[PDB]
């Protein structure tokens, strides 16, 4: 078969999936064809509005030759936060998201509570309610954890 992926600027990508193909695979195909990495891609059924499930073949989610999927691209950058022992660990973060949410990401990434540390950039403390753009993180920049 063959499936159409539409985007808000009228692009339409024609991705052909046959067997048990997975939405991860879909995102990868479209990623190659549009130079936008699979994680920066949110996909949803055209009108069924249910955001598709990951590990499952698309052919279960009622996807078929002729169907249409909408792709919206969310932008984020990759950064590093480093821990008390000094090991940077990567993270994919959205600039509008809150710090709290990065803070909550570094919790379960490094198994700690979020009541314990500062979180600082350019040795500037980062307030849990503000968004990350406030502090101007860039690609591959490095945030600090302060117990």
């Amino acid at each position: 078969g063959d499936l159409t992926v539409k985007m808000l600027g009228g692009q339409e990508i024609l991705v052909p999936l046959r067997d048990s193909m997975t939405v991860s695979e879909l995102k990868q195909f479209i990623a190659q064809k549009i130079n936008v990495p699979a994680f920066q891609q949110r996909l949803a059924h055209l009108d069924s509005r249910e955001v598709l499930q990951e590990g499952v073949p698309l052919v279960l989610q009622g996807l078929r030759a002729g169907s249409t999927v909408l792709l919206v691209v969310q932008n984020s950058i990759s950064i590093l936060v480093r821990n008390d022992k000094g090991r940077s660990s990567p993270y994919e973060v959205q600039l509008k998201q809150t710090v709290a949410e990065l803070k909550q990401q570094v919790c379960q990434k490094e198994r700690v509570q979020a009541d314990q540390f500062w979180l600082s950039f350019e040795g500037r403390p980062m307030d849990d309610e503000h968004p990350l753009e406030e502090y101007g993180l860039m690609k591959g920049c490095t945030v600090f954890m302060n117990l």
Binding site: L8, G9, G10, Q11, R42, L43, A44, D47, R49, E50, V51, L70, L71, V72, Q74
Partner: protein
């Protein structure tokens, strides 16, 4: 610049149509300041001239007026604000 394909002029028509409708709804709350109200009006005029010149070069089967472009404008605005395609439709 960012590289855009064909149909970016059209989808920019629609996106800025919804931008206009946002303003309009805003100024109903007596919230649009005076330079911004005039920003609303300049936007509306410049948009309608863009809509007729654009619509002339499109099929009658896809030729839409300003007020129906503004409705797609809202539909693309809700997906942008919630970063969900699941907000385009009754969500």
């Amino acid at each position: 610049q960012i590289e855009v394909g064909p149909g970016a002029t059209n989808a920019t028509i629609n996106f800025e149509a919804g931008i206009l409708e946002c303003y309009e709804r805003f100024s109903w709350q007596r919230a649009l300041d005076y330079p911004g109200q005039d920003r609303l009006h300049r936007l509306k005029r410049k948009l309608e001239s863009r809509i007729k010149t654009h619509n002339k070069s499109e099929p009658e089967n896809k030729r839409m007026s300003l007020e129906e472009r503004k409705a797609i404008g809202v539909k693309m605005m809700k997906v942008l604000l919630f970063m969900d395609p699941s907000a385009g439709i009754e969500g």
